Design a protein around this ligand. Structure first.
Ligand SMILES: COc1ccc(NC(=S)NCCCn2ccnc2)cc1OC
Ligand SMILES: [Zn+2]
Length: 323
């Protein structure tokens, strides 16, 4: 084998100080994200649609314009759906693709198809336009610091296609993109030339954002083998609050709760979990009240919650990568 795959286990953050924290909090811009990253994704974008091509062009253009040297790949493939064989396209965004280890942030960019009841269209605002915009705003806000990337450890973004069921949530009608990509990565040697390690060995931590943007979210701590990382989020939130850097935020209504959970919730991280990759699943439970209705729209999102989570996520990635 090789030794580097085990560094994720012992990896520790480079904790940030009061001054840096202020600089992060100030460096992220909620209304720039809103106008430039989010609003254009608030469109119907089910697999194959016009909006899907549009959302993919948007995500890629917004990344390609940054200073950091992001290598974009599209994992396009065909899969059997209840409505025939269809085309799906995962978007992968990697700094230092030959970097042995990556922290991986992920979300899905497709929206669920609903027929247009009452003359309205499902735009999946929490599900997951806001998580996509959060990733793009992260890449923008952190861009100056990501430059530094030129431990062999870097950053990857994954925007999964076809997370949603076409008809009803089941094993063969859901997770089209993550199931394909996990299998692709599993059989691909990493770094190249390697004999016993795959791109999955290189995934330090898979952080999956889903269903983000409603007010008062509460995020359970889901799995045994990722909890110190969850604990870091709890700490970052605490410190950001104490330093007075969150908005409309009370410590009683903390997002990250050391409340444990019964069932896992099925999502794009499952085909990676099944292959033994560590996962931080940032999905709230209860799901937003608007979940899978036409009310999951822009007007029901909460500015301050998203701003706060953005601040917290950007800190977390700065600490994990030692930047
Ligand atoms: C209504 O609240 C729930 C409904 C279902 C589940 N259980 C599962 S396994 N859901 C898989 C969700 C997959 N997905 C993610 C985004 N779009 C679809 C939990 C819920 O509240 C905790
Ligand atoms: Zn959904």
């Amino acid at each position: 084998a090789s030794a580097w795959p085990e560094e994720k286990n012992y990896h520790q953050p480079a904790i940030l100080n009061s001054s840096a924290l202020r600089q992060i909090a100030e460096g992220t811009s909620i209304s720039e994200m809103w106008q430039n990253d989010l609003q254009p994704l608030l469109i119907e974008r089910y697999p194959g649609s016009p909006g899907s091509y549009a959302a993919r062009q948007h995500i890629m253009q917004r990344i390609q314009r940054l200073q950091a040297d992001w290598v974009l790949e599209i994992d396009t493939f065909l899969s059997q759906t209840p409505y025939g064989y269809r085309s799906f396209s995962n978007i992968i965004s990697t700094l230092n693709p030959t970097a042995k280890r990556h922290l991986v942030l992920a979300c899905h960019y497709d929206s669920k198809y609903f027929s247009h009841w009452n003359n309205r269209v499902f735009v999946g605002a929490t599900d997951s336009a806001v998580p996509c915009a959060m990733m793009l705003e992260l890449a923008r806000a952190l861009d100056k610091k990501l430059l530094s990337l030129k431990p062999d450890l870097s950053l990857q973004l994954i925007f999964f296609d076809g997370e949603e069921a076409f008809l009803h949530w089941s094993p063969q009608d859901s997770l089209y993109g993550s199931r394909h990509l996990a299998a692709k990565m599993a059989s691909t040697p990493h770094p190249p030339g390697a004999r016993g390690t795959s791109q999955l060995h290189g995934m330090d931590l898979l952080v999956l954002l889903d269903l983000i943007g409603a007010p008062n979210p509460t995020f359970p701590n889901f799995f045994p083998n990722s909890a110190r990382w969850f604990e870091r989020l709890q700490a970052i939130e605490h410190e950001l609050h104490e330093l007075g850097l969150l908005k409309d935020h009370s410590l009683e209504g903390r997002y990250f709760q050391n409340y444990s959970y019964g069932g896992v919730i099925q999502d794009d991280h499952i085909p990676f979990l099944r292959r033994g990759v560590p996962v931080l699943h940032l999905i709230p439970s209860p799901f937003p009240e608007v979940w899978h209705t036409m009310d999951d729209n822009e007007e029901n999102l909460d500015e301050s919650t998203i701003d706060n989570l953005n601040k917290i996520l950007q800190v977390f990635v700065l600490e994990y990568l030692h930047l």
